[PDB]
Amino acid sequence: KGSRFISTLQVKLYGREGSSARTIKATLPYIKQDIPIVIIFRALGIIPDGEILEHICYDVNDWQMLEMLKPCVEDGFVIQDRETALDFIGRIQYAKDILQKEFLPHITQLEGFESRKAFFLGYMINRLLLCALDRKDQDDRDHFGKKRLDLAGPLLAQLFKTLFKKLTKDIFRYMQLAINAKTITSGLKYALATGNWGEQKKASRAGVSQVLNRYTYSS
Amino acid sequence: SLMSCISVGTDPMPIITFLSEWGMEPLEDYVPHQSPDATRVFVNGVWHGVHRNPARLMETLRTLRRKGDINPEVSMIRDIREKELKIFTDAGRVYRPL
């Protein structure tokens, strides 16, 4: 309701069946390597390896779930407190910004919510394991309830927002009302007239504004 | 198809408040080591809180939109077999009447 945000999050269980190196790591927006699921947990604020396991395990009797959680604790046992965690993400405090901002922002990007960011993270490592122990058939990427579709509104919403985009950075040039007015009109015009959905003049989901069909009222 | 329609976009704030006033515990004061039968609430992919007995929750709500207090396009669901409750004020859902 305020952007597009193309920064996705990956959390993967390494080591297939028979490999005892089943370390769980996580790739995050704007960060090179995959960070062990413990280092990110302490950069959050949850410190003791053992206190993080309630965020993952919602019933400390799934002894076979906690057995895969062994090495990832030792994989990130070298870092112990919150400070050391986010330096390995690299004055070098800049990791706290990326964690607070471009990371699980469908929760809020304000700091003080460090507990929902962890209890959601553990819930993800949770659901990841149920498929590893075949207590869940992996989700259906071809399931239709999981699919949404943008009609005229949200399509115009992306275009109107991405049009107003560099309109306000063009009024920032009126200092160094007599502002630009054609750009909002000729942009809405272009995308709805070409089918290549706008994006300045570089095409991008071409074939979305099709001309209507008038052979039979049914058609 | 004919009788199909598409969601339009509802606001989530006047219902996440209706949760906190009917048995929702936010997850800052939540540790599962005293409540495992903790059912999980979800609104558009956001885990806001926890409830205990969803029996009279998911049915006081299922009769709350049926009278008009909540928007009819917002979809309920509780997965009993997995103890979860997701709610979608989303924009893009393809709802049929029945």
Partner: peptide, 24 residues
């Protein structure tokens, strides 16, 4: 989709200060 765009979600994109917007 268009009515709910023009009515509400069109105003939401106003963030020398922008206020309520009217369309003829």
């Amino acid at each position: 989709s268009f009515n709910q765009f023009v009515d509400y979600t069109l105003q939401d994109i106003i963030c020398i200060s922008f206020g309520k917007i009217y369309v003829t």
